[PDB]
């Protein structure tokens, strides 16, 4: 499962532990019970979501592999209840790719110059910063110093291990119109993979707990 | 599937696991824009991360256990906050008996004025009285959440424990050690055994370079 | 600030870092604007779900509570705890004995006074068995396992206002056990005294429980 | 207490809850004898009883380049509130390394030229950003051309146990020189507020190198 985001980004599912029944099993230990049948198990997921019983959902875990601009990674990495491993800016080899917004990214905004010129101006400063970085590297400046001139739209990569409860909090905050459009796009991809692996939890989440707007207006 | 019996009626059972040693190799190699390599280089990387303190790659390995343990042991266990728990509700569940009765051997090395067999019998006796008092209160309409407060700390509970390998290794450092209570040491030995089966390279490197306790090496 | 709970328990404030203005400063990101504008900002953050500024307000409490209550409390992982050791600490060997009023509303086969007496009686027998084991040379870590769940323990609880408000949402509520709801009312009272604007805005916009809106705190 | 770091950065202490005695009281579960209390701090540090140190909490106000903040914000057992790149007003200041930052490196051009080339690209990126903003481009889009050396500001609330983990990892020669400088300032403030815990930490638990070679 890999979903392309923006001009060069992606969200890829690396691994997953459990499914909707993992939350059913974790919740049923409360009354000294285990699993039952599909209809009763789906009814239990809805019940847990409708009444705020969130801890059973922590037993479902995902590992994603994400390629995203640093300005998006910075917002994402604010979610502390998760595990991260990212490309090292000090020692890693990079692809040196950058997010260049298309003119449509500026639709709705009254700009003094055409949106096409905004796209061109961003490519131009990206090209100059990248060339300056290459000149510094070629002259023996260490990468940890030379890379500080690179713009915030430079692409990075990281592994993200997160349980369904923390993933639903991430979706509440990022799959929402108050979040930056670029991270909303990534949150739609995370929601799509979550829905495929945990359909009952995802449907119950949208029905009872989801506080955002875009997941109820856009089919994922 | 993997199940280890602990104490007289307890157990530790493996419910699920995400990943293996290569999950930590993959997570660490993203730093240099690399992925997996060959068996020898990958095992060498696990030992390198362990000995130099690069712990975050081990968070991408996750386990779910199903545990049955006495409440005095669960109270110590539940202090490990970097993990997920779901436990039996004493407020809303039928009490299916089950208490940890130490065997006479638990008192070996202690000079007691009564035989250790009598200690075992005295513990079974007070457990039986507390349990029947609890049943009498329940039968008379006292809610479970009030009636259960008379039950002793050796009553068995059950719980699901979801924990990543980094937090699991912190748990082993603290509990798979002679300073921890013998009863939780037994449970930590079962946790270590299952971890070793699923992540042999991480477990071997952990014992060799990072493990601070004593009993796993004995 | 100390508030008595149950028959022998308490919640006592040990220390506090910050007040309502600590959340205002964190939200504006400035170590340096008008009481009305600052109170308006607290209500704005509470009403729109901007929770992280409230993490910069921290409390330390000293709690004396029965073990069954402490087990429920210690499920709140986003906090710091230090508790009396069951293996090595000296204990007062006090126990929570519910008063007959705890059984009001329940149709019991025996008078609620008899339930109170039966609980004190099994507590006394368990305590005497524990003493017999200790006197015979059984270590405390083994002998104490016969003690009932109503035995009082003590702990330090260091928690920030965001995690404290999650605790109030879950424990200052009729679905939580009455015994922990009493402790959560005391925590709410101390929180209100130290952070009146955050507490008032919390009740008005974010609080999901019932009892803090029905009982004067 | 405010300490200047780099060319335009700083670490400032906003608030603190407790001192060494907060860990002593937490360990004993009790709410004064200097020698016995200091002996207890060393005992806990030496035997790995870390949880009593969580009852000491600090709030700092930090101004640091984004490349340093990204490394810092990897410490999840802490609270942060940062300037919003999407909506906040900014000073628009940037870390320009001085020629001394390139000491020991064999460069094909003088280290002074590296400093000049960095100031030059920063100035061009900043001017491009201003041109976009002036033409109506939202800040959340225009800001993506700004370099990683742009200074951000944040509040950091962290307990002493997590702060000691941060010092173990960042007040060390394997960490990037820039974040080592900030970790030295944090160590200095921590030492002033918790002298016994800081000294016991260096003696028994500290795994880094620079705090045992440099007086803070
Ligand atoms: C639209 C928008 C706009 C902004 C921001 C977010 C969004 C969605 N943020 C980021 C925000 O403050 C926060 O850092 C992230 O949304 C992460 O949210 P959580 O803390 O809920 O997730 P996280 O994954 O960190 O934690 C998950 C849950 O665990 C709990 N938790 C974790 N750590 C805790 C702690 N130490 N104390 C208490 N509870 C804790 C909480 O219950 C939380 O919901 C922000 N930030 C900023 O600094 N300045 C800004 O201007 C903005 N702007
Ligand atoms: C010199 C150097 C070099 C690098 C890095 C760090 C340093 C010091 N890092 C960053 C590193 O992976 C890590 O994110 C930070 O050092 C934060 O460290 P902690 O997780 O210990 O602190 P943090 O404050 O996040 O946690 C504190 C403690 O809580 C525990 N903990 C917190 N959350 C946990 C969780 N979910 N599960 C288990 N335990 C948890 C651990 O005990 C930890 O010590 C890195 N990163 C990277 O991605 N790529 C890189 O190349 C590098 N390079
Ligand atoms: C009325 C009632 C009834 C019950 C229970 C609670 C209540 C209020 N519980 C306890 C419940 O499952 C939970 O352990 C506590 O209420 C603690 O709540 P939080 O996890 O929200 O707080 P906590 O302080 O642990 O966490 C604060 C916040 O951080 C986040 N968080 C922290 N750690 C996280 C993690 N690892 N992953 C994801 N997010 C994380 C969440 O956002 C959370 O709200 C329960 N329990 C049970 O096992 N069986 C039962 O029968 C019951 N019954
Ligand atoms: C032999 C023995 C004896 C005792 C105890 C333990 C052991 C092993 N304890 C329990 C002890 O205080 C602690 O609660 C547990 O060992 C859990 O340890 P961690 O915090 O390491 O794990 P946990 O799983 O909670 O955390 C994992 C890691 O995350 C980090 N971490 C998590 N939350 C954090 C926070 N809020 N701030 C900073 N870092 C955080 C740390 O790096 C920690 O190593 C104790 N307790 C007690 O109160 N009284 C006692 O007498 C004893 N006795």
DSSP codes, chain A = -EEEETTTEEEEEEEEE--HHHHHHHHHGGGT-----HHHHHHHHHHHHHTT--GGGGG-EEEEEEEEEHHHHHHHTT--SSEEEE--TTT------B----GGGGTTS--SS-HHHHHHHHHHHHHHHHHHHHHHHHTT--HHHHGGGSBTTBEEEEEEEEEHHHHHHHHHHHSSTTS-HHHHHHHHHHHHHHHHH-HHHHHHIIIII---SHHHHS--
User: Cβ < 6 Å from ligand 4: which residues?
Assistant: B 79-83, 167, 170, 174, 179-180; C 80-83, 85; D 51, 54, 77, 159, 161-162, 165
CA distance C124 to B87: 29
C-alpha closest to that of B1 among C105, D170, D29, B12 = B12
CA distance D92 to D62: 16
Q: Do A214 and A180 touch, CB atoms closer than 8 A? A: no
The neighbour count for residue B174, using CB atoms within 10 Å, is 18
C-alpha closest to that of D138 among A176, A69, A178, A108 = A108
For tokens 């002074």, name the residue.
D112
The DSSP H or E segment spanning C117 is helix C112-135
Give A178-185 contacts, CB < 8 A, sequence gap 24+. Answer: A179/A75, A180/A71, A180/A72, A180/A75, A180/D86, A180/D140, A181/A105, A182/A6, A182/A69, A182/A71, A182/A72, A182/A99, A183/A72, A183/A75, A183/A76, A184/A214, A185/A5, A185/A6
The three-point CA angle A49-A55-A59 to 5° equals: 105
For tokens 């990037």, name the residue.
D176
CA distance D199 to D201: 5
Residue identifier of the C-alpha nearest atom 52 of ligand 3: B89
C-alpha closest to that of B6 among B192, B150, B218, B170 = B192
Min Cα separation B13/chain C (Å): 22
Distances (CA, A) of D170 to D1, D185, D207: 20, 11, 10
Size of interface B-C (CB pairs under 8 A): 127
By the CB < 8 Å criterion, does C80 face chain D? yes
Question: For chain D, what percentages of helix, strand and coil (3-state, to nearest 5) are there?
Answer: 50, 20, 30
Helix (H, G, I), strand (E, B), or coil: what is residue C5?
strand
Q: In this structure, is the dihedral angle defined by the CA atoms of residues C187, C193, C199 and C203, taken in order, positive or negative?
A: positive
C-alpha closest to that of C76 among C151, C187, C178 = C187
Q: Which of A105, A131, A174, A192 is catalytic?
A: A174
The neighbour count for residue A41, using CB atoms within 10 Å, is 18
The neighbour count for residue C117, using CB atoms within 10 Å, is 14
In chain C, beta strands by DSSP E = 2-5, 9-17, 58-66, 80-83, 152-160
B82 and B159 housed in the same domain: yes
Residue contact D124–A121, C-beta within 8 A: no
Ligand 1 atom nearest A82 alpha carbon: 24
Q: Do D2 and D60 touch, CB atoms closer than 8 A? A: no
Q: In C, which residues are within 8 Å of B107 by CB distance?
A: 138, 142
C109: tokens are 């086969």
For tokens 């002259």, name the residue.
A139
Let me know if residue A93 belongs to a domain: no
Q: Is B157 annotated as a binding residue?
A: no
By the CB < 8 Å criterion, does B59 face chain A? yes
Q: Do D191 and D13 touch, CB atoms closer than 8 A? A: no
CA distance D149 to D95: 5
Size of interface A-B (CB pairs under 8 A): 100
Distant-in-sequence, close-in-space partners of A120: CB < 8 Å, separation ≥ 6: none
C-alpha closest to that of C62 among C153, C161, C159, C156 = C156
Angle (deg, nearest 10), helices A20-28 and A38-50: 80
CA distance C28 to C56: 13
Residue identifier of the C-alpha nearest atom 42 of ligand 4: D162
Q: Do C77 and C170 touch, CB atoms closer than 8 A? A: no
Ligand 3 atom nearest C78 alpha carbon: 24
Q: Which of B174, B180, B191, B215 to probe ligand 4 with, by most ligand atoms within 8 A of CB?
A: B174
By the CB < 8 Å criterion, does B193 face chain C? no
Q: In D, which residues are within 8 Å of C62 by CB distance?
A: 29, 31
D18 and D108 housed in the same domain: no
Min Cα separation C123/chain D (Å): 25
C-alpha closest to that of C54 among C187, C204, C190, C163 = C163
Residue contact B18–A16, C-beta within 8 A: yes
For tokens 């524990």, name the residue.
C130
Cα torsion B204, B208, B210, B211 to 10°: value is: 80
Helix (H, G, I), strand (E, B), or coil: what is residue C171?
helix
By the CB < 8 Å criterion, does C92 face chain D? no
Residue C27: closest CA among chain D residues belongs to which residue?
D81
Residue contact C156–D81, C-beta within 8 A: no
The three-point CA angle D202-D205-D208 to 5° equals: 70
C-alpha closest to that of A201 among A36, A98, A47, A62 = A47
Helix (H, G, I), strand (E, B), or coil: what is residue D36?
helix
What secondary structure, in 3-state letters, does chain B show? CCEEEECCCEEEEEEEEECCHHHHHHHHHHHHCCCCCCHHHHHHHHHHHHHHCCCHHHHHCEEEEEEEEEHHHHHHHCCCCCCEEEECCCCCCCCCCCECCCCHHHHCCCCCCCCHHHHHHHHHHHHHHHHHHHHHHHHCCCCHHHHHHHCECCEEEEEEEEEEHHHHHHHHHHHCCCCCCHHHHHHHHHHHHHHHHHCHHHHHHHHHHHCCCCHHHC
The three-point CA angle B17-B22-B24 to 5° equals: 85
Resolution in A: 1.9
C-alpha closest to that of D84 among C26, A118, A110 = C26
CA distance D90 to B77: 47
Q: Do B130 and B150 touch, CB atoms closer than 8 A? A: yes
CA distance B161 to B64: 6
A6 and A80 housed in the same domain: yes
C-alpha closest to that of D194 among D78, D75, D79, D57 = D57
The three-point CA angle A131-A134-A140 to 5° equals: 145
The DSSP H or E segment spanning D15 is strand D9-17
Let me know if residue C92 belongs to a domain: no
B128 and B30 housed in the same domain: no
B132 and B210 housed in the same domain: no
B139 and B159 housed in the same domain: no
Q: Is A65 annotated as a binding residue?
A: no
- Residues 150-179 on A with a CB inside 8 Å of B are 157-159, 161, 163
Query: How many domains does one find in chain C?
Result: 2
Task: Give the single-character DSSP code of C183.
Answer: H
Q: Within its chain, how far is the Cα of C150 from the centroid?
A: 15
Of B19, B56, B92, the CB nearest to A30: B92
Q: Which of A62, A88, A93, A160 to probe ligand 2 with, by most ligand atoms within 8 A of CB?
A: A88
CA distance C154 to C10: 9
B29 burial class (0-12, 13-18, 19+ CB within 10 angstroms)? buried
C130: tokens are 């524990």
Q: Is B79 annotated as a binding residue?
A: yes
C-alpha closest to that of C151 among D128, B98, B154, B135 = B154
B123: tokens are 């513990």
Helix (H, G, I), strand (E, B), or coil: what is residue C23?
helix
B161 and B118 housed in the same domain: no
Question: For chain C, what percentages of helix, strand and coil (3-state, to nearest 5) are there?
Answer: 50, 20, 30
Let me know if residue C62 belongs to a domain: yes
Task: Give the single-character DSSP code of C174.
Answer: T
A19: tokens are 């499914």
The DSSP H or E segment spanning C24 is helix C20-28
Q: Do D83 and D90 touch, CB atoms closer than 8 A? A: yes
Residue D176: closest CA among chain A residues belongs to which residue?
A144
Q: What is the DSSP string of D106-167?
A: --SS-HHHHHHHHHHHHHHHHHHHHHHHHTT--HHHHGGGSBTTBEEEEEEEEEHHHHHHHH
C155 and C140 housed in the same domain: no
Ligand 3 atom nearest C171 alpha carbon: 8
C-alpha closest to that of C94 among C102, C84, C105, C103 = C84
D60: tokens are 């700092």
Q: Is A174 annotated as a binding residue?
A: yes
Q: Is the CB of C52 under 6 A from ligand 1?
A: yes
CA distance A198 to A170: 16
- For testing contact with chain D, the best of A96, A151, A160, A185 (most D CBs within 10 A): A151
HSE at residue D68, side-chain half, CA atoms within 13 A, is 27
Ligand with smallest separation from the Cα of B160: 3
Residue identifier of the C-alpha nearest atom 50 of ligand 1: D84
CA distance A203 to A101: 32
Domain extent, residue D65, equals: 2-83+153-210
D79 and D159 housed in the same domain: yes
Q: Which of D28, D36, D139, D170 is catalytic?
A: D170
C-alpha closest to that of C72 among C172, C160, C199 = C172
Let me know if residue C91 belongs to a domain: no
CA distance C92 to A65: 54
C-alpha closest to that of B166 among B77, B39, B54 = B54
D2 burial class (0-12, 13-18, 19+ CB within 10 angstroms)? exposed
Edge-to-edge strand list for the sheet holding B62-70: B3-6, B10-18, B62-70, B156-164, B84-87
Cα torsion D89, A152, D162, B75 to 10°: value is: 110
Beta bridge partners of A156: A68
CA distance A167 to B66: 23
D24 and D123 housed in the same domain: no
Let me know if residue D19 belongs to a domain: yes
Task: Give the single-character DSSP code of D94.
Answer: B
Distance A54 CA to ligand 3 centre (A): 7
Q: Is the CB of A173 under 6 A from ligand 3?
A: no
B32 and B122 housed in the same domain: no
Q: Which residues of C138-152 are buried (b: 16+ CB within 10 A; e: fewer)?
A: bbbebbbbbbbbbbb
Let me know if residue A200 belongs to a domain: yes
Distance C76 CA to ligand 3 centre (A): 6
Residue identifier of the C-alpha nearest atom 2 of ligand 2: D175
Residue contact C56–D54, C-beta within 8 A: no
Residue D95: closest CA among chain A residues belongs to which residue?
A148
Residue B31: closest CA among chain A residues belongs to which residue?
A87
Distant-in-sequence, close-in-space partners of A114: CB < 8 Å, separation ≥ 6: A103
Distant-in-sequence, close-in-space partners of A163: CB < 8 Å, separation ≥ 6: A57, A58, A59, A60, A61, A62, A81, B84, B162
HSE at residue B44, side-chain half, CA atoms within 13 A, is 6
CA distance A57 to A55: 5
Of B100, B141, B153, the CB nearest to C107: B141
CA distance D125 to C146: 71
Q: In C, which residues are within 8 Å of B146 by CB distance?
A: 98, 102-103, 115
A138 burial class (0-12, 13-18, 19+ CB within 10 angstroms)? exposed
Helix (H, G, I), strand (E, B), or coil: what is residue C37?
helix
A135 and A188 housed in the same domain: no
D60 burial class (0-12, 13-18, 19+ CB within 10 angstroms)? buried
- Residues 133-152 on B with a CB inside 8 Å of C are 133, 136-137, 139-143, 145-146, 148-152
C-alpha closest to that of D59 among D153, D154, D164, D157 = D157
B88: tokens are 């039996």
CA distance D83 to D90: 8
- Residues 14-33 on D with a CB inside 8 Å of C are 14-18, 22, 25-27, 29, 31
CA distance B181 to B194: 20
Task: Give the single-character DSSP code of C147.
Answer: S
C-alpha closest to that of D51 among B187, C85, B212 = C85
Q: Do C132 and D2 touch, CB atoms closer than 8 A? A: no
C-alpha closest to that of C7 among C127, C73, C91, C100 = C100
Helix (H, G, I), strand (E, B), or coil: what is residue C2?
strand
- Is A131 an active-site residue? no
C-alpha closest to that of B100 among C216, C78, C142 = C142
User: Cβ < 6 Å from ligand 2: which residues?
Assistant: A 83-86, 88; B 31, 56, 59, 82, 164, 166-167, 170; D 74-78, 162, 165, 169, 174-175
Distance D51 CA to ligand 2 centre (A): 18
C-alpha closest to that of A40 among A56, A28, A52 = A28
CA distance B51 to B70: 35
Q: Do A7 and A103 touch, CB atoms closer than 8 A? A: no
CA distance A133 to D152: 22
**Rg (chain D; Cα; Å):** 20
Residue identifier of the C-alpha nearest atom 39 of ligand 2: B167
D187: tokens are 């160590």
Distant-in-sequence, close-in-space partners of A4: CB < 8 Å, separation ≥ 6: A10
The experimental method is X-ray
For tokens 């959560």, name the residue.
C184
The neighbour count for residue C196, using CB atoms within 10 Å, is 14
HSE at residue C150, side-chain half, CA atoms within 13 A, is 27
**Breaks in chain D (C–N > 2.5 Å) following residue:** 31
Q: What is the DSSP string of A173-198?
A: HHSSTTS-HHHHHHHHHHHHHHHHH-
CA distance D53 to D163: 10
HSE at residue C175, side-chain half, CA atoms within 13 A, is 10
CA distance A157 to D4: 33
Distant-in-sequence, close-in-space partners of B142: CB < 8 Å, separation ≥ 6: C103, C106, C108, C115
CA distance A170 to C89: 43
C-alpha closest to that of C120 among C101, C96, C104 = C96
CA distance C66 to C9: 8
Let me know if residue A31 belongs to a domain: yes
Phi, psi angle pair for C113, to nearest 5° = -60, -35
């Amino acid at each position: 499962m890999k979903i392309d985001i923006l001009d060069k980004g992606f969200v890829e599912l690396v691994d997953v532990m459990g499914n909707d029944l993992s939350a059913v099993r974790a919740a049923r230990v409360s009354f000294d019970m285990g699993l039952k049948d599909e209809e009763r198990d789906r009814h239990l997921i809805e019940y847990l979501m409708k009444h705020g019983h969130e801890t059973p959902f922590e037993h479902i875990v995902f590992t994603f592999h994400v390629k995203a601009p640093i300005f998006v990674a910075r917002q994402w990495f604010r979610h502390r209840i998760a595990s991260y491993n990212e490309l090292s800016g000090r020692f890693s080899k990079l692809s040196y790719e950058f997010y260049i917004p298309s003119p449509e990214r500026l639709e709705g905004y009254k700009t003094t110059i055409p949106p096409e010129r905004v796209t061109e101006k961003i490519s131009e400063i990206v090209d100059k910063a990248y060339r300056t970085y290459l000149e510094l590297i070629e002259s023996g400046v260490p990468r940890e110093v030379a890379r500080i001139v690179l713009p915030l739209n430079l692409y990075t990569r990281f592994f993200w291990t997160v349980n369904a409860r923390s993933l639903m909090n991430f979706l509440n905050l990022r799959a929402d119109s108050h979040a930056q459009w670029e991270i909303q796009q990534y949150a739609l991809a995370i929601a799509r993979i979550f829905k495929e692996k945990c359909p009952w939890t995802f449907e119950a989440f949208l029905k009872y707990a989801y506080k955002g707007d875009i997941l109820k207006e856009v089919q994922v």
